[PDB]
Structure 1
Amino acid sequence: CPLMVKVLDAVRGSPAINVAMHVFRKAADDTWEPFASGKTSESGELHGLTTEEEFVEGIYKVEIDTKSYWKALGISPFHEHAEVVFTANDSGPRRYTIAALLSPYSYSTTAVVTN
């Protein structure tokens, strides 16, 4: 699992379940092409997005549909979504966890990059 995404809810103190997201890779045309997608599990985690062979260096964007998450709960959000844009670099072995912590008017994201 070269890339995993985990989403947490700071209002309810729980995993953010059934959160949809799409992952894009930047194309030579400087356009965003779909690469992978899914919805978070009951643990708030989305595994199996890609494979080691498929996850090459480049610029990736994870677009998390936070607005639909807050709407299903009845809570009025600020953001249309949460975009996380980063460069994947293949110098030495690296596995990536992208995490997002969600509030209606705030979000935090961090990367946990391990060998």
Structure 2
Amino acid sequence: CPLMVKILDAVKGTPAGSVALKVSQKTADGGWTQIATGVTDATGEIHNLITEQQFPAGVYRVEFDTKAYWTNQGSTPFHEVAEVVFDAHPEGHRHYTLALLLSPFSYTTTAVVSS
């Protein structure tokens, strides 16, 4: 699992379960192509989101469907989506964790990149 997520709900104080996301890779011409989808489990994580073979060096975009998450919680959200875009260098089994803390009108995102 070279690419992990950890999503927390700042209203309830729990992980954010059943958050849908989409992973895209930047193409040589400057656009995007979607390579994977996932939904968080009750711990706010997605196991086996993509394989190492699917995660070579390059720029990736992870789109988190925060609007649906909040709608399904019965809240009104501000953001249409939460996007995280980063250049990955998985050389040497370098692993990436995208952390996301959700509120209806706010999110915080950070990354933990292993050695």
SS in 2 for 1:75: coil
Structure 1 gaps of 5+ residues are none
Distance 1:61 1:50, change over 3 A: same
The equivalent of 1:44 in structure 2 is: 44
**Moved >2 Å (runs of 4+):** 90-93
Match of 1:9 in 2: 9
Q: Secondary structure at the match of 2:29?
A: coil
Q: Give the drift of 1:51.
A: 1.4
Q: For 2:73 and 2:90, locate their aligned partners in 1 and report how far apart those are by CA, in whole Å.
A: 39
Question: Does the residue aligned with 2:56 lie in a helix, a strand or coil?
Answer: coil
Name the SS of the counterpart of 1:45 in structure 2.
coil
Q: Deviations over 1:3-48 (max 9, x none)?
A: 1111110000001000000000011121110011110001110121
Shift of residue 91 of structure 1? 4.7
Identity %: 57
Name which of structure 1's ranges 82-91 and 103-112 shifts more when overlaid on structure 2. 82-91
Aligned to 1:29: 29
Which residue identity does 1:65 align to in structure 2?
Answer: D
Q: Residue 64 of structure 1 aligns with which residue?
A: 64
Runs of 5+ consecutive residues of structure 2 not aligned to the other structure: none
Q: Deviations over 1:65-102 (max 9, x none)?
A: 00000001111111001000000014543111111000
Q: How many residues align?
A: 115
Cα RMSD between the aligned structures? 1.1
CA distance in 2, matches of 1:30, 1:45: 29
8 A Cα contact 2:55 2:90, kept in partner: no
1:103 is aligned with what amino acid?
Answer: S
TM-score by length of 1: 0.95
